């Protein structure tokens, strides 16, 4: 643990990236987090929204 | 653009619609800009036979 500082930095960055990646699983209010399902399921006028 | 359809198919005259008329007879673009006007013509287009 002596080099904690350096390790800490790494950890922080990793967390950011991890968080970023997990944000791909969020619908953000849409009907599905999967783009292809939205494209295939709804009509273009509402799939666009 | 003038034509005649049946009432149930009036819904199909709109951007991003599917069905008989939209697929095979008259298709509007998804980004259509303009107006659609429809009125009953039973007295004019119907015949006893």
DSSP result, A12-49: HHHHHHHHHHHHTT--TTSS-S-HHHHHHHS-HHHHH-
In angstroms, this model's resolution equals 2.8
Please tell me whether residue B17 adopts helix, strand or coil conformation. coil
Does A44 contact B30 at a Cβ distance shorter than 8 Å?
yes
User: How far is it, in rounded angstroms, from Cα A31 to Cα A48?
Assistant: 12
- Give the integer Cα–Cα distance in Å for A18 and B40: 60
Most B CBs within 10 Å, among A38, A40, A42, A43, to test the B interface: A43
Token pair recorded at residue A30 = 């849409």
Contact assessment for residue B15 and residue B27, using Cβ atoms and an 8 Å cutoff? no
Element (H, E) at B31: none
User: Token pair 């003038």 is at which residue?
Assistant: B2
Specify the residue for token string 């939205």. A38
Please count the other Cβ atoms lying within 10 Å of the Cβ belonging to residue A4. 9
């Amino acid at each position: 643990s002596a080099l904690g500082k350096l390790q800490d930095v790494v950890n922080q960055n990793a967390q950011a990236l991890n968080t970023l990646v997990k944000q791909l699983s969020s619908n953000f209010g849409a009907i599905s987090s999967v783009l292809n399902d939205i494209l295939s399921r709804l009509d273009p006028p509402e799939a666009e929204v | 653009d003038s034509f005649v359809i049946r009432g149930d198919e009036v819904r199909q005259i709109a951007p991003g619609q599917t069905g008989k008329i939209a697929d095979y007879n008259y298709k509007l673009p998804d980004d259509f800009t303009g107006c659609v006007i429809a009125w009953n013509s039973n007295n004019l287009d119907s015949k006893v036979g």
